[PDB]
Design a protein around this ligand. Structure first.
Ligand SMILES: Nc1nc2c(ncn2[C@@H]2O[C@H](COP(=O)(O)OP(=O)(O)NP(=O)(O)O)[C@@H](O)[C@H]2O)c(=O)[nH]1
Ligand SMILES: [Cl-]
Ligand SMILES: [Mg+2]
Lengths: 169, 241
């Protein structure tokens, strides 16, 4: 069996934990309990392959930035999450991606852009802005909502597929 | 009338440079003995504009960045004198192991014995903090009280919790997880220690947040230790505020 090491990154309050918990425990948390670093394991089936997901749910609070250097070397793929109603979360992904490339010394590393809270009617980040930044990065883009579970499985599975494409042949 | 012009001009600074802004605002208003007046406005403008307590000082807003800056500037020497004696005792410490995740546990090591070394270290750190009231720097008590006074205006039943979680999440726990990066130690601890410090900060955060472990399955066995330290933590926060 193959193990995929996924890391979920992004600003605080974006919904990184709510998406992970929706995959692991199949329910939506309405508590906002800021994460330090959480680890989860789950076995799924993806394109007919049974495999293990080793998920690391990281801290969006900037006070814990000294921890980023370690999980970015250990992780194979990265979910970059922003909320579609918070435009500073979109500006923060710039710094996350260019700090993953600096630590891995690679201009191409598995990565998926994720816009969370699509259940919300108010939207300050249009869909064309994220799709255009995703094409700028050669990476997919998936709109998700942890509250309604729309697109959460698509998000993790497309990251696994992006990891498969980065493996030699 | 220095404050109403500084608040008007802060509207202009975009979100990319809130770090420099918080530094500039605090260095400016402290050198004029008006730090308490700046913190009151900023903290009031993030409690009045909150729907509920859940989303209050979370994330990294401008007022949040000002608060973190104050903890780091006025509590720097207090945290190092408080944590340095405890870090050097657990670093130098024979055959201690802190891995409590069964998926990552070495076969030779015991789980129930690794859990007890984590709890033993957590007491020493937790007991040191709640007994440090008399060494608190005065500038830091006014920051904590100002937050407590502001949050109590609209949320009396949650003010004590907000101050404690804020102090642990943006001041103490960052230092424990990365002591070398915070200036406390002169070298990164060995990886076995770094693992324990990170796991311990999680336990301390639960006590400050007054909520039990409900997500990671390997952290639930510490819920009994967490319940027994809620009141002692609220008494320590009631003293600072
Ligand atoms: N409406 C809505 N709220 C959401 C959604 N996802 C998360 N939230 C809410 O946003 C808040 C923060 O969620 P959380 O998952 O803890 O975000 P986080 O990225 O883990 N925060 P941190 O980085 O500090 O650990 C909670 O109130 C949660 O209910 C979503 O898709 N829709
Ligand atoms: Cl004003
Ligand atoms: Mg989280």
């Amino acid at each position: 069996m193959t193990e995929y090491k996924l890391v979920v990154v992004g600003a605080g309050g974006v919904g990184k934990s709510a998406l992970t918990i929706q995959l692991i425990q199949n329910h939506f948390v309405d508590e906002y309990d800021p994460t330090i670093e959480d680890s989860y394991r789950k076995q799924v089936v993806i394109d007919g392959e049974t495999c293990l997901l080793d998920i690391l749910d990281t801290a969006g609070q900037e006070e814990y930035s000294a921890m980023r250097d370690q999980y970015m070397r250990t992780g194979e793929g990265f979910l970059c999450v922003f909320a579609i109603n918070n435009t500073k979360s979109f500006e923060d992904i710039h710094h996350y991606r260019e700090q993953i490339k600096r630590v891995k010394d690679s201009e191409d590393v598995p990565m998926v852009l994720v816009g969370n809270k699509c259940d919300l009617p108010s939207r300050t980040v249009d869909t064309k802005q994220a799709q255009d930044l995703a094409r700028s990065y050669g990476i997919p883009f998936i709109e998700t909502s942890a509250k309604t579970r729309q697109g959460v499985d698509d998000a993790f599975y497309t990251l696994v597929r992006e990891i498969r494409k980065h493996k030699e042949k | 009338g220095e404050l109403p012009i500084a608040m008007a001009l802060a509207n202009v600074v975009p979100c990319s440079q809130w770090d420099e802004l918080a530094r500039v605002l605090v260095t400016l208003f402290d050198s004029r003995h008006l730090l308490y007046q700046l913190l009151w406005n900023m903290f009031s403008k993030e409690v009045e504009l909150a729907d509920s307590m859940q989303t209050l000082f979370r994330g990294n807003s401008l007022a949040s960045k000002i608060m973190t800056f104050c903890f780091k500037v006025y509590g720097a020497t207090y945290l190092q004198k408080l944590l340095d004696p405890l870090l050097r005792i657990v670093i130098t410490w024979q055959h201690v192991s802190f891995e409590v995740d069964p998926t990552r546990l070495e076969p030779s090591e015991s789980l129930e014995e690794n859990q007890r070394n984590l709890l033993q270290m957590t007491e020493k750190f937790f007991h040191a903090i709640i007994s440090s009231s008399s060494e608190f720097p005065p500038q830091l008590r006014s920051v904590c009280h100002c937050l407590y006074q502001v949050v109590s205006q609209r949320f009396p039943q949650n003010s004590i919790g907000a101050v404690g979680s804020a102090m642990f999440l943006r001041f103490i726990n960052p230092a424990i997880v990365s002591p070398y990066e915070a200036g406390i130690l002169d070298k990164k601890p060995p990886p076995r220690i770094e693992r324990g410090l990170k796991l311990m900060s999680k336990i301390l955060q639960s006590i400050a947040n007054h909520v039990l472990f409900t997500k990671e399955e390997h952290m639930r066995p510490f819920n009994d230790f967490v319940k027994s330290n809620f009141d002692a933590a609220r008494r320590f926060f009631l003293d600072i505020a």
